[PDB]
Structure 1
Amino acid sequence: ATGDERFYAEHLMPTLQGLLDPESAHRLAVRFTSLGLLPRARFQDSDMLEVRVLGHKFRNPVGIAAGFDKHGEAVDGLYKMGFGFVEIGSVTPKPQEGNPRPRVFRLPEDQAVINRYGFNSHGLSVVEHRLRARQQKQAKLTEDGLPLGVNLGKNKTSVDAAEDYAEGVRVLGPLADYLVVNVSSPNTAGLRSLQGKAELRRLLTKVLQERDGLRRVHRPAVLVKIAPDLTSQDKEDIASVVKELGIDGLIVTNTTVSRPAGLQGALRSETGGLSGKPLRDLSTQTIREMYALTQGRVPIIGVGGVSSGQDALEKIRAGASLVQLYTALTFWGPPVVGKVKRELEALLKEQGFGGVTDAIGADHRR
């Protein structure tokens, strides 16, 4: 049940959201997290939540998705919250402002958010120095089952997308357990076209060459993060390229540019990517498809609308080895992490799984 879950979800978060504009709230959340001003994460991770994937041990399979800690300011606070892994970014090569404010919108009636941040980023150099300041602390955390992902973007005005990603691999690759080639932001003109077969093969060949050129101890896994809005053709092409090139994994999915029938929020027709509950099943179905297309041989990090243990287990059974959440944190606060983990453990036991690993892709074997 938990007292603070109820307190954060029913009282504290909705009260604070009533007082603070969305981006002000985001900024305050990053600040509070970075300072460790967080409730006591009392959930002890059980052995049945441990997952071995991407050349690493993950103490639990619940991560924070990209876009919360864009500039790597709150990594340690996020582990304190009870996340099994942290992904920072997206980070662009040069600093850039992103879109004019306002650029984030709450849809409380839908338990959703729409954002059009447009890759606001401190840039590679700032983030590099921030990560270097805690590099050995991270090495110990990783060893202890708490890996770090770095999500790479491209600048708005760059004339060579592949070179932007290559720069990211060179600069932040040595500080990351895994890198994410984010070709699925809905908020950068032309970006999602990099998901097309020919463009993706060329781009990923260059990214993988740059990764392979790093020293062994500094050589991260490379994942591609994909949209929920892809055609069947697009998904077939991505699966083919992933297998051809030996891409280490997929992150499924980014936000949607669709607006599902039934959205109630006043701000439903704002431009941007939609996240949270209305994305959940679209993301789950995309995980399911990508798992089948890759014959279950390519690790998937499942993301989109995870707010409960059931949501997490649905993505795991569809083929995810790990899951992430973001929007649920914005509505329910830090206790949501312990909630998801406790519920997930209980459901695994109820469905006769020895642990998370046993449940990965279970629906495909029914």
Structure 2
Amino acid sequence: ATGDERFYAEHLMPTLQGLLDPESAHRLAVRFTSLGLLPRARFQDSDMLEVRVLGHKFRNPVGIAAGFDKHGEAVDGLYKMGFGFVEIGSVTPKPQEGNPRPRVFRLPEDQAVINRYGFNSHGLSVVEHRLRARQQKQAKLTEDGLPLGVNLGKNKTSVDAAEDYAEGVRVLGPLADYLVVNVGKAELRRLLTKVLQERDGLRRVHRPAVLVKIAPDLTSQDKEDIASVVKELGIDGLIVTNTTVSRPAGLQGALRSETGGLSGKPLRDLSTQTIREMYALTQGRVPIIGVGGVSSGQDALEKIRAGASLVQLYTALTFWGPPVVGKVKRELEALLKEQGFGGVTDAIGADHR
């Protein structure tokens, strides 16, 4: 542990939580990040942490999950924080406000958050122009092993969900290294067929990978159906998982019964187990980005061994601050060595073998 890590986790973040309501804290974090007002990320990525997947090189396997930079305002700051890849969004076709405030809640006793933002979004056009302003800068970053993902949502009032996602593919697909869609079976197949057709219609230099992001709350039937459709259609990857609408026994936070998705430590092993299941259902042939409750190297390695090629974190920033990124990377590198892995790649799915 560095001095910065301990200072942030033990002193600064608890103090700042006392001063800032959750959505204010989130907004101020985005602003600070976008301006580069960050502690030094002195951790230097080693070759051990490099991963090749989804048609790209990732300098390190620790990404920022969707929902932090919903509108593409802080991408460069997020790379400066040490993330190996950045996912923005969710972005909806038309701008929309989301749910009324308050809509974000901290459960500090649980190292958890509950949110019901409701896909607040500046909309595709605004984000398109924001990404266009730095498109060549991003091309260089991606070439250097720092890819960009875009998570596509749908508007609240949309009649045709597939058409909302198709619009996102057309508008932000050409600016992304990968796209994400959050998810009967025939209907899923029809939607993903439309998304992939739109993707395939982009010019080759502008053609992203397409991933499906799933919730931790799906039935066994749902998961078997998704695995089947993903393999049938050649979906490029899975993101496992979004937040949970479950409320695990043992939550202590006063706000535990707020409506919304639960993230952070109580989601962690639900997410890891869903990774394990999806890796098995897809025979290890479909790359998985593992996400949910990662706040340490052990957490990251458990997801990688369960089947994830990459991981993301988000909620841990609330409690550990920006130094958590270097913390997870340093700890992951140490554990890989301790467990006889040459690098991240050797550890992917190692539990299944």
Q: TM-score, normalised by structure 2?
A: 1.00
SS of equivalent to 2:150? strand
Determine if contact 1:228/1:254 at 8 Å carries over to the other structure: yes
Determine if contact 1:283/1:304 at 8 Å carries over to the other structure: yes
SS of equivalent to 1:268? coil
Give the C-alpha shift of residue 156 in structure 1: 0.3
What do residues 303-339 of structure 1 show as CA deviations (whole Å, max 9, x unaligned)?
0000000000000000000000000011110000000
Determine if contact 1:51/1:57 at 8 Å carries over to the other structure: yes
SS of equivalent to 1:86? strand
Structure 2 CA distance, aligned partners of 1:177 and 1:322? 14
Larger deviation, residues 11-20 vs 241-250? 11-20
Match of 1:333 in 2: 321
Give the C-alpha shift of residue 129 in structure 1: 0.2
Determine if contact 1:302/1:315 at 8 Å carries over to the other structure: yes
Match of 2:208 in 1: 220
SS of equivalent to 1:113? strand
Give the C-alpha shift of residue 200 in structure 1: 1.0
SS of equivalent to 1:214? coil
What do residues 143-176 of structure 1 show as CA deviations (whole Å, max 9, x unaligned)?
0000000000000011100000000000000000
Structure 1 CA distance, aligned partners of 2:14 and 2:74? 23
Determine if contact 1:90/1:182 at 8 Å carries over to the other structure: no
Structure 1 CA distance, aligned partners of 2:293 and 2:218? 18
Determine if contact 1:89/1:152 at 8 Å carries over to the other structure: yes
Structure 1 CA distance, aligned partners of 2:28 and 2:290? 27
What do residues 195-251 of structure 1 show as CA deviations (whole Å, max 9, x unaligned)?
x41221010000000000000000000000000001110000000000000000000
Aligned length: 353
Structure 1 CA distance, aligned partners of 2:7 and 2:186? 51
Give the C-alpha shift of residue 182 in structure 1: 1.6
Give the C-alpha shift of residue 255 in structure 1: 0.2
SS of equivalent to 1:270? coil
Give the superposed CA RMSD. Answer: 0.5
What do residues 16-49 of structure 1 show as CA deviations (whole Å, max 9, x unaligned)?
1110110000000000000000001000000000
Match of 2:34 in 1: 34
Structure 2 CA distance, aligned partners of 1:78 and 1:44? 15
Structure 1 CA distance, aligned partners of 2:247 and 2:182? 22
What do residues 270-325 of structure 1 show as CA deviations (whole Å, max 9, x unaligned)?
00000000000000000000000000000000000000000000000000000000
Determine if contact 1:149/1:179 at 8 Å carries over to the other structure: yes
Structure 1 CA distance, aligned partners of 2:319 and 2:203? 41
Structure 1 CA distance, aligned partners of 2:145 and 2:213? 22
Give the C-alpha shift of residue 13 in structure 1: 1.0
Structure 2 CA distance, aligned partners of 1:199 and 1:72? 30
Structure 1 CA distance, aligned partners of 2:53 and 2:261? 29
Q: Does residue 1:308 correspond to 2:296, yes or no? A: yes
Structure 1 CA distance, aligned partners of 2:10 and 2:128? 39
Structure 2 CA distance, aligned partners of 1:325 and 1:172? 23
Structure 2 CA distance, aligned partners of 1:124 and 1:101? 23
Which consecutive segments of 4 or more residues in structure 1 shift more than 4 A? none
SS of equivalent to 2:268? helix
Q: TM-score, normalised by structure 1?
A: 0.96
Structure 1 CA distance, aligned partners of 2:331 and 2:312? 15
Structure 1 CA distance, aligned partners of 2:71 and 2:182? 15
Match of 1:286 in 2: 274
Give the C-alpha shift of residue 140 in structure 1: 0.0
